[PDB]
């Protein structure tokens, strides 16, 4: 998948901890299960990610 | 006198589209060079109108070209005419004679206002005979000479000033208007034209008046044509002519003007109509260069509104806490207990004409809305002059040695007169006071004790000799006297908030509750807005409404069916505008 | 952190807005209304100078 | 500001008595009891409301003051109706519509005006301020310095 | 600078703080206090951005 090479690929794992709610829709949580992780509960406030 | 009409016709409300029409001057301010944003009462932008139309000419059935139209916030009223035939605004009025009827006719030999109070009749029309001079011998609008409020002549007025021409000679445009208890009217004359023109045009303010009154239609007024010529009846005998009129009907919208050299407006765009509009005002400029542009957002708005509180009926006994024949001393001020009832506090305010219910951290309009948690009555009698001295944080003897509240204290006094009951014949002694103590007494803290001390050393032990003095003191409470050394009853309601175990509060009544709906909800004085849907977090039986990551509460415990839902803001994003510029198109693309 | 400050009272009432409406009348509502929005205007000011 | 005159017979609710005058019909309209020796709650008292709304509109009142002549080109103070504020107060070739009075700008400040009586457009200007920069070679040199205004 | 901002009213009765809370009442004086640090602590973070 992609055109990735095999440095890369190591590098996109050590670092990649979070990539962040790159608008995530907000039918991935509208209060169903658990949910209410740390994007979420700041999506409700107004605070986004472009 | 009045005669009733007849002959009434019905046709199609024919519409037709204003091509941005109906903007005046907001204030009267002199500005230039500025593309200001107002927000006041405009007719939208491209809307349909109204048009009525005068037809059925000769004396075959001449219509019922005088209908009643509602007057919802505003009036829009056009005219397009070459006889000068329509008049006679009546707006404003319930038509029942239930207040002030309000007229407008001119026209005659010199414009003329009339206000009075009448009693309206049951069918109006302003009679015009075809003789030389055309003048109103009939009042059929009004028989009556009840009262009469204002009069009122003006001089320049709706005079059709310009020469003898075939074409339609004037278009006259006004607008009605309520500004929260008077009626504000403007206008402007405009030339021929060769059924609304296209252009841009600003209407210069006129004569306004109060009257203030109750609202339900509004009214038109023709003249009459009657005429020899014909056979007709009283009601409808006239000849009917040719006229055009519009309505519109005024809404709240935010406008972005822009004046010229001369102080005059030259141009408008309505925001909230297109995508291209709102941006054309983010920018606050009439042209967009091309890019990306975030406008607002959009938010789902709730449809309904539910409530829900505890079904418990009991009364509360807030009787004998103040009717108790007997209150107790100052330093005995016998706490009471109240809980699982419903309190009602306007059947409090039913005491002495010397009342003093003021309220700290509460407003004392807003008890019955609110649900408590254990309230507390405590009643006691103090001197005259002492009722302002008990407060919050406030030193003095009876604060520091004998009640003593809490610096952030919740809950509120009650101070009633007792001249004749708490005063005997020779006075009375039975209220007591200590005068001295050992230190400050804490808070909510209640102690009793008669026990001579070492005053100034030397222990008594109960001697009770010199430099011992007794720390009960008595109260005279002369029959009469003055009101600083008089008796008062006082009583103190604390009550602890922030609403865990709701227990008491009023009469609020239940309504079904909705699950799946952008809805407001009133849970136990717990405002807000959200969907409720059903929840799966596991609560223990001790546990009531929950949290989240941050103080916003996340799940809330049904009162009456025991049950856990949940709440989140029904919708939200952001709206952006892709335009290619403005001198190259006017579409745009959207996207949220 | 601009999360977890919304929840201070900034010497008023109370922290949430409905609350304080509901509980007070417009006249004195209007000095803990302004004292929170204040607050927090400060507080978003921060967030977008650092 | 809302005012009534019904005087006919008010519904009571549910179970209406069709306002016949009969049983379960309520009479909104009563009369005082007033006495000589009564409660002071009770006593009879005169009440008057009067209100009045500041706006851009002429005004109407202004009672006993003192009337001035009126100067031009210097940096007075002036107390147009109830307008203060200091300014040169020269002649202005702005085109004032009848109904217009006050003129502004972008900040909210009054620039034009209209005199009461003499009826004529005034420009406001707040007179000159501004200048700073003494110019100094050094203490131990000399005391000797220029200003820049 | 950042010294010498500590000795001046901030729209207040003094500048000094045994003035303040004690020898009056709890309002009031609970609201010049309120002034003080809110001031002091806008110093505070004006000298950190600097
Ligand atoms: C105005 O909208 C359309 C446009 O012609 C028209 O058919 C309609 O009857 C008018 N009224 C309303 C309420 O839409
Ligand atoms: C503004 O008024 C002047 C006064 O003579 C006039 O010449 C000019 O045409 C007016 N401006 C416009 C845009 O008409
Ligand atoms: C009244 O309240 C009790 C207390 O929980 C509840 O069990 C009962 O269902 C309620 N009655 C109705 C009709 O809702
Ligand atoms: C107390 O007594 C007065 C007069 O007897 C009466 O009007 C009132 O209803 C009683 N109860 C309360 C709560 O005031
Ligand atoms: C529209 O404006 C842009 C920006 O100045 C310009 O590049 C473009 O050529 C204009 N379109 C024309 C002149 O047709
Ligand atoms: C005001 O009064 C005096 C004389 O009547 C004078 O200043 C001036 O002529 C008057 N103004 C007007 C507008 O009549």
């Given at each position: 998948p992609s055109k990735r090479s095999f440095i890369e690929d190591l590098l996109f794992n050590k670092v990649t901890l979070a990539d962040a709610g790159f608008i995530k829709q907000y039918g991935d949580c509208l209060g169903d299960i658990a949910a209410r992780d740390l994007i979420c509960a700041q999506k409700f406030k107004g605070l986004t990610v472009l | 006198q009045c005669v009733n009409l007849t002959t009434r016709t019905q046709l199609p409300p024919a519409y037709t589209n204003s091509f941005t029409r109906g903007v005046y001057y907001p204030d009267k301010v002199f500005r230039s060079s500025v593309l200001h944003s107002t927000q006041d009462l405009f007719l939208p932008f491209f809307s349909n109108v109204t048009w009525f139309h005068v037809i059925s000419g000769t004396n075959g059935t001449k219509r019922f070209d005088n209908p009643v139209l509602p007057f919802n916030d505003g009036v829009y009223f056009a005219?397009?005419?070459?006889?000068?035939?329509?008049?006679?605004?009546?707006?404003?009025?319930?038509?029942?004679?239930?207040?002030?009827?309000?007229?407008?006719?001119?026209?005659?030999?010199?414009?003329?206002?009339?206000?009075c109070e009448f009693q309206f009749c049951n069918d109006p029309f302003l009679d015009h005979k075809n003789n030389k001079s055309?003048?109103?011998?009939?009042?059929?609008?009004?028989?009556?000479?009840?009262?009469?409020?204002?009069?009122?002549?003006?001089?320049?007025?709706?005079?059709?000033?310009?020469?003898?021409?075939?074409?339609?000679?004037?278009?006259?445009?006004?607008?009605?208007?309520?500004?929260?208890?008077?009626?504000?009217?403007?206008?402007?004359?405009?030339?021929?034209?060769?059924?609304?023109?296209?252009?841009?045009?600003?209407?210069?303010?006129?004569?306004?008046?109060?009257?203030?009154?109750?609202?339900?239609?509004?009214?038109?007024?023709?003249?009459?044509?009657?005429?020899?010529?014909?056979?007709?009846?009283?009601?409808?005998?006239?000849?009917?002519?040719?006229?055009?009129?519009?309505?519109?009907?005024?809404?709240?919208?935010?406008?972005?003007?822009?004046?010229?050299?001369?102080?005059?407006?030259?141009?408008?765009?309505?925001?909230?109509?297109?995508?291209?509009?709102?941006?054309?005002?983010?920018?606050?400029?009439?042209?967009?260069?091309?890019?990306?542009?975030?406008?607002?957002?959009?938010?789902?708005?709730?449809?309904?509104?539910?409530?829900?509180?505890?079904?418990?009926?009991?009364?509360?006994?807030?009787?004998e806490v103040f009717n108790a024949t007997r209150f107790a001393s100052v330093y005995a001020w016998n706490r009471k207990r109240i809980s699982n009832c419903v309190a009602d506090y306007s059947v409090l305010y039913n005491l002495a004409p010397f009342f003093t219910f003021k309220c700290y951290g509460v407003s004392p309009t807003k008890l019955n809305d609110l649900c408590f948690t254990n309230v507390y009555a405590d009643s006691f009698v103090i001197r005259g002059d002492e009722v302002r001295q008990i407060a919050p944080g406030q030193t003095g003897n009876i604060a520091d040695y004998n009640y003593k509240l809490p610096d952030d204290f919740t809950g509120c006094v009650i101070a009633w007169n007792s001249n004749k009951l708490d005063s005997k014949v020779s006075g009375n002694y039975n209220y007591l006071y200590r005068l001295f103590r050992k230190s400050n007494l804490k808070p909510f803290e209640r102690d009793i004790s008669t026990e001579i001390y070492q005053?100034?050393?030397?222990?008594?032990?109960?001697?009770?000799?010199?430099?011992?003095?007794?720390?009960?003191?008595?109260?005279?409470?002369?029959?009469?006297?003055?009101?600083?050394?008089?008796?008062?009853?006082?009583?103190?309601?604390?009550?602890?908030?922030?609403?865990?175990?709701?227990?008491?509060?009023?009469?609020?009544?239940?309504?079904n509750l909705v699950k799946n709906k952008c809805v407001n909800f009133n849970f136990n004085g717990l405002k807000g807005t959200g969907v409720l849907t059903e929840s799966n977090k596991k609560f223990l039986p001790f546990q009531q409404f929950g949290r989240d990551i941050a103080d916003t509460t996340d799940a809330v415990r049904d009162p009456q069916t025991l049950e856990i839902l949940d709440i989140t803001p029904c919708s939200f994003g952001g709206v952006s505008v892709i335009t290619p510029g403005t001198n190259t198109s006017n579409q745009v693309a959207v996207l949220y | 952190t601009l999360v977890k400050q919304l929840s201070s009272k900034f010497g008023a009432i109370s922290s949430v807005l409905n609350d304080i409406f509901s509980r007070l009348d417009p006249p004195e509502a209007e000095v803990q209304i302004d004292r929170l929005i204040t607050g927090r205007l400060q507080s978003l000011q921060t967030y977008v100078t650092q």
């Open positions: - | 005219s397009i005419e070459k006889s000068n035939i329509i008049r006679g605004w009546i707006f404003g009025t319930t038509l029942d004679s239930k207040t002030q009827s309000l007229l407008i006719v001119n026209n005659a030999t010199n414009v003329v206002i009339k206000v055309w003048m109103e011998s009939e009042f059929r609008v009004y028989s009556s000479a009840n009262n009469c409020t204002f009069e009122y002549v003006s001089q320049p007025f709706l005079m059709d000033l310009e020469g003898k021409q075939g074409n339609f000679k004037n278009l006259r445009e006004f607008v009605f208007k309520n500004i929260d208890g008077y009626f504000k009217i403007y206008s402007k004359h405009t030339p021929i034209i060769v059924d609304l023109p296209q252009g841009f045009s600003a209407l210069e303010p006129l004569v306004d008046l109060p009257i203030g009154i109750n609202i339900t239609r509004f009214q038109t007024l023709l003249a009459l044509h009657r005429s020899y010529l014909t056979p007709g009846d009283s009601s409808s005998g006239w000849t009917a002519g040719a006229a055009a009129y519009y309505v519109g009907y005024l809404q709240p919208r935010t406008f972005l003007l822009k004046y010229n050299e001369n102080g005059t407006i030259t141009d408008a765009v309505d925001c909230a109509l297109d995508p291209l509009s709102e941006t054309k005002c983010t920018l606050k400029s009439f042209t967009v260069e091309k890019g990306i542009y975030q406008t607002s957002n959009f938010r789902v708005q709730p449809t309904e509104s539910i409530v829900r509180f505890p079904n418990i009926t009991n009364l509360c006994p807030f009787d005053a100034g050393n030397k222990p008594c032990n109960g001697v009770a000799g010199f430099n011992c003095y007794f720390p009960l003191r008595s109260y005279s409470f002369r029959p009469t006297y003055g009101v600083g050394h008089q008796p008062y009853r006082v009583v103190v309601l604390s009550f602890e908030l922030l609403h865990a175990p709701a227990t008491v509060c009023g009469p609020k009544k239940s309504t | -």
